[PDB]
Amino acid sequence: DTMKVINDPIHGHIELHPLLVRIIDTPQFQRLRYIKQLGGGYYVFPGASHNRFEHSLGVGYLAGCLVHALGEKQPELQISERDVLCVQIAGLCHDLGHGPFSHMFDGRFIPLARPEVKWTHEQGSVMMFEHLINSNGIKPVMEQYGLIPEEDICFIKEQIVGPLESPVEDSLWPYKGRPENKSFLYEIVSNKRNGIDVDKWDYFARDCHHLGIQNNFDYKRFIKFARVCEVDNELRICARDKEVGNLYDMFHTRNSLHRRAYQHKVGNIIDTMITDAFLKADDYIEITGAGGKKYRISTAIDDMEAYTKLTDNIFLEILYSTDPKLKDAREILKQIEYRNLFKYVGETQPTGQIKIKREDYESLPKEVASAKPKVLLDVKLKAEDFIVDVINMDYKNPIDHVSFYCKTAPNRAIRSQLLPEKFAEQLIRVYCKKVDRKSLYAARQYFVQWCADRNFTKPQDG
Amino acid sequence: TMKVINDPIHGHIELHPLLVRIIDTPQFQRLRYIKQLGGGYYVFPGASHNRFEHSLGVGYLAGCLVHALGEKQPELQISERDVLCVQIAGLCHDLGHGPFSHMFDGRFIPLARPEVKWTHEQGSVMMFEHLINSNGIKPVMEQYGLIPEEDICFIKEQIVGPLESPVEDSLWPYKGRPENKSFLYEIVSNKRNGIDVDKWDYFARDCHHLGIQNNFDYKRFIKFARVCEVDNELRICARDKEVGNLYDMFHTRNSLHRRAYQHKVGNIIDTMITDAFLKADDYIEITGAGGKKYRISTAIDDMEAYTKLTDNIFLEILYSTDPKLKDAREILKQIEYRNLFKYVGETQPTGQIKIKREDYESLPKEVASAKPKVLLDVKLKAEDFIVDVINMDHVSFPEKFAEQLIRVYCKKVDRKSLYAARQYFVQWCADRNFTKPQD
Ligand SMILES: Nc1nc2c(ncn2[C@H]2C[C@H](O)[C@@H](COP(=O)(O)OCCCNC(=O)c3cccc(-c4cccc(Br)c4)c3)O2)c(=O)[nH]1
Ligand SMILES: Nc1nc2c(ncn2[C@H]2C[C@H](O)[C@@H](COP(=O)(O)OCCCNC(=O)c3cccc(-c4cccc(Br)c4)c3)O2)c(=O)[nH]1
Ligand SMILES: [Fe+3]
Ligand SMILES: [Fe+3]
Question: Rounded to a whole number, what is the distance in Å from the CA of A377 to chain B's nearest CA?
Fold first, then answer.
């Protein structure tokens, strides 16, 4: 067993430690070759055929790079090759939990199928990671290369999903994989506080590569000039002051990707259509899991053996099906091929109001059809004619939450409107399955009255 | 009306409504599910791209070239109708590709049905006809100024070549356009000098997705391209100062062939996928016209069934529980675990000899029949061998190259079996009179 070299269009030659290779060459990891990074965006952006597998490789590579650079610059931090391998594995496996079409699956489908359950792709990543280890004898390999499986598995899972929870006192280091003097390690793969992690670096670069958008962030420069420094008796990753411009570009790039691609109107309508087909197919598709037990699309998340076989393939399985009981679902997918899509009715925001929770998504269409427009309208619409799409931008923490250092005093952190505009953390769009112009006028009337009733933003276009 | 597409390599791409209506069909959308490089993706994580985007690019480039020629040289009499027909031909040139692209017509069908002559170009013509007739395109073509009778034939001739050659009759064989428009047949698929918009797009795109340097600039070609007479025939000619660009292109191609298309592990994996397909052929069902069920290897006889034959077959086998599919499944599972066929050696045919597809299936048997020379402890059957045949393909105004390579891999992995396989391979090369292998 020796290292391997993979040639990647974003990162060039990426070296893989044999333990990482052993983890990658499993059904549980190879599964990610069959889940598109951007879900339905590929039906708007023909270049966006990339899957979660290559992005995961990139994230592992970048995690290794950043942590090694910090160790080389600062021996005093006592970063060991064991720590590097654990951070690399966490970067590799952070997206194991994604379902078909990525953010579509846990963002919208599962809430609509089982409003009662609380599912995230991060929980799924933890579950798939455990399953991959116990299905492939990874623990002896980990030991072979100096890892301590109990502690280090806990550390990886903590990087992926976060602390054990049970806040309780909260004045105390909540993690168990590593102690406080290695806190900065938890800031590499997934950093919620300020929004700078190697995961975002890779998918910013990769999505820009595949979409045709320019990426002005130089992650390599940032890695070169990153260090560890002291803030409030804690240790954090900080950037050289001279890097401010780089960060500006990063944030702007983020904004562009969100505005032009991630919340593209037609792409999200198509995500909605695919989810509708999945909902109308859920009762009739079986996925065989542990013990030959059958599962549905919406319940495969409860058995990782079944989840392992749940990918974008399900789309085609519905499209190619001959079962009469699936015809409904099939038809919707066929409308996608013929480009007979749901009609965009409008957009609104819950500005100043409580935001819409996942557990309530299913109730929204009914609400819309229950609005009473103050005109005859001579055309009545039902709940199933409406789609309500809730688009959440998940980060209010600009550059301000970043720590900087001077080349004069590297160990200590330092104490404009040109920064990117705010994110509008929740958008609510409505589409109509009926396409005749009378039905669309009626649907718009219903939508405007519904926004009035909910005290949401008055829709534009009027 | 006029849609715009935002391609990663061509930027913004405006599309005529007729082209959009051709694209928005199951028969064309199918290409979203066929990977451009087949199994190369299992070696290059960036090579996730499919034939659909490539086809869009080829149509766009064909339009660009024809229109650029038309703006210049008005004496050629290029109508918008000609531009639209060329764009459609470029758009539809790859409709006939099967699962994993060149793996299908290049290896799988020859092994499965050694007696049929199948190519993805003739499949493209069949699928184009099926698309036209299943979605009422002819009235739309008329609506935009086309003559379906002449122009459908024109498109099919652009894709597959002359419909003729039943007898000698050596003269102008095209029926879709007169000889004075002959140059239009050189745009989408050029058989003479290997210069066409299809190659431009897929060189650029494969470079973009593989991480390989693209040294040439097709825009310079289009801007400095003209039509001129060469030996009493109209042809696409280039301003002389463009030679430096031309060479660059041929370097890129060369690199793309050596680094990616002929990658040893990628070709081994193509072979493994084909072996799985063979062991699933008796059992996989693909519903076709009238509800008749087809196999993978016979789905090419019904375009309705072929419309539903894509890379998904792979996963259909991987996810199956039918015990009859177990063997196929296991091969795919080995791919996931990276327990691959072992590489035994490489050789070349001598002189102009070219092994033909109809004989591919005979090659392993031959290898297992060679008498090694000394003796052997382990004996290997024909099923233990894979013989992989790899092929590679005067412009008017530097590396290995070998018309055919034959590589042998072994399925048994132990050292003893691999030594035996090497002995078989070297003897077989001696018996066919092929070049003695390496080492
Ligand atoms: N066409 C296409 N575009 C593609 C493709 N790959 C990427 N693109 C890029 C370029 C496009 O400009 C962009 C956005 O898509 P769009 O189709 O132009 O629609 C935009 C408006 C919202 N869409 C609908 O509501 C709609 C649209 C069209 C028809 C119908 C309809 C018609 C009859 C009955 C019914 Br019932 C529904 C509804 O995506 C592709 O393969 N095909
Ligand atoms: N691993 C991986 N690499 C990947 C991946 N995506 C791209 N790559 C790039 C990086 C790699 O350097 C390059 C080439 O692939 P390789 O896996 O390194 O194998 C090279 C020789 C193949 N030939 C064999 O026969 C072989 C090889 C190894 C083991 C066995 C074997 C072992 C036990 C029993 C049996 Br029975 C067979 C056989 O592909 C990926 O997902 N995974
Ligand atoms: Fe990620
Ligand atoms: Fe092509």
Answer: 30
Sequence-ordered list of residues with C-beta below 8 angstroms from that of B291, at least 6 positions apart, any chain: none
Q: Pick the atom of ligand 2 nearest to A53's CA.
A: 41
As a CATH number, domain B342-432 is 3.30.70.2760
- CA-to-CA distance for A343 and A462, rounded, in angstroms? 18
Ligand nearest to C-alpha A270: 1
Say if A25 is an interface residue toward chain B (CB within 8 Å).
Answer: yes
**Which ligand 2 atom minimizes the distance to the CA of A6?**
10
Interface test with B, best of A1, A7, A214 (most B CBs within 10 A): A7
Give A181-223 as a 3 state SS string: HHHHHHHCCCCCCCCCCHHHHHHHHHHHHHHCCCCCCCHHHHH
Domain boundaries A343-454, CATH class: alpha beta
Ligand 1 atom closest to the Cα of residue B3 is 12
Ligand nearest to C-alpha A4: 2
SS3 B292: coil
Residue B420 token pair? 């035996």
Counting beta carbons within 10 angstroms of the beta carbon of residue A407, is it exposed (0 to 12), middle (13 to 18) or buried (19 or more)?
Answer: exposed
Q: Does A137 touch chain B (CB under 8 A)?
A: no
> Under a CB-based contact definition with an 8 Å cutoff, are residues A381 and A131 in contact?
no
Residues for chain A: how many in total?
Answer: 462
Burial of B338 (0-12, 13-18, 19+ CB in 10 A): middle
CB A449 within 8 A of CB A371: yes
Q: What's B291's DSSP letter?
A: G
Instruction: Indicate yes or no: CB of B45 within 8 angstroms of CB of A57.
Output: yes
**Which pairing describes strands B225-229 and B234-238: parallel, antiparallel, or unpaired?**
antiparallel
**How many angstroms is it from A219 CA to the middle of ligand 3?**
16
Resolution of the experimentally solved model in angstroms:
2.5
* Atom 34 of ligand 2, nearest CA residue: B339
Q: What is the CB neighbour count within 10 angstroms for residue B336?
A: 17
H or E element in which residue B405 lies: strand B404-410
What are the residues whose beta carbons fall under 8 Å from the beta carbon of A8, sequence distance 6 or more? A14, A54, A57, A58, A61, B45, B46, B211
If you measure CA to CA, which chain A residue comes closest to B307? A320
Tell me the CA distances in angstroms from A94 to A9, A25, A84, A91, B414, one per residue in order: 21, 16, 15, 6, 37
Q: What is the 3-state secondary structure (H, E, C) of B29-97?
A: HHHHHCECCHHHHHCCCCCCCEHHHHHHHHHHHHHHHHHHHHHCCHHHCCCHHHHHHHHHHHHHCCCCC
| Candidate of B275, B338, B409, B416 to mutate for ligand 2, largest count of ligand atoms within 8 Å of Cβ | B338
